[PDB]
Write a protein that binds this ligand. Structure first.
Ligand code: HEC
Length: 87
C-alpha cells in the first residue's frame, strides 16, 4: 500500500549498504531481523532513528531520501524481512 515506496528508497539508497537485507559494512547488524533485532532495534522507531541519521558508519537520511521513506524505508525493512526480504 505505501511500503512500495519503501523498496523505492531502500532499492535506490539503502541498497548501496545493504542490498539483500544483508549489511554491506558490518558483519552482524543486518536488515532482516535476527541481528538488527538480536540486540534490539528492528522496530520502525529503531531503524527510523538509525536512518534519519544513520548510526556509527551509516549515512543519515533525514533529508537524503524523500521523507516518507526515511519512514516507509524503516517500516519497509519490517515488511521485507517479515516475509522474504525482496527474496
Ligand atoms: C553505508 C555506509 C550505509 C548506508 C548507505 C546505509 N546503511 Fe544502514 N547501516 C550501515 C552500517 C555500517 C550499519 C551498522 C552501524 C550500526 O547500526 O551500529 C548500518 C546499520 C543499519 C541498521 C541496523 C541498525 C542497528 O541494529 O543498529 C538498519 C536497520 C539499517 N542500517 C538500515 C538502513 C537503511 C534502510 C538504509 C537506507 C536509509 C541504510 N541503512 C543505508 C551503513 C549504511
Amino acid at each position: 500500500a505505501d511500503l512500495a515506496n519503501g523498496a523505492k528508497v531502500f532499492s535506490g539508497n539503502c541498497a548501496a549498504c545493504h542490498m539483500g537485507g544483508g549489511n554491506v559494512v558490518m558483519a552482524n547488524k543486518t536488515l532482516k531481523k535476527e541481528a538488527l533485532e538480536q540486540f534490539g532495534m528492528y522496530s520502525e522507531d529503531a531503524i527510523i532513528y538509525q536512518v534519519q541519521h544513520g548510526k556509527n558508519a551509516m549515512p543519515a537520511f533525514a533529508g537524503r531520501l524523500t521523507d516518507e521513506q526515511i519512514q516507509d524505508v524503516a517500516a519497509y525493512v519490517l515488511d521485507q524481512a517479515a516475509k522474504g526480504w525482496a527474496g
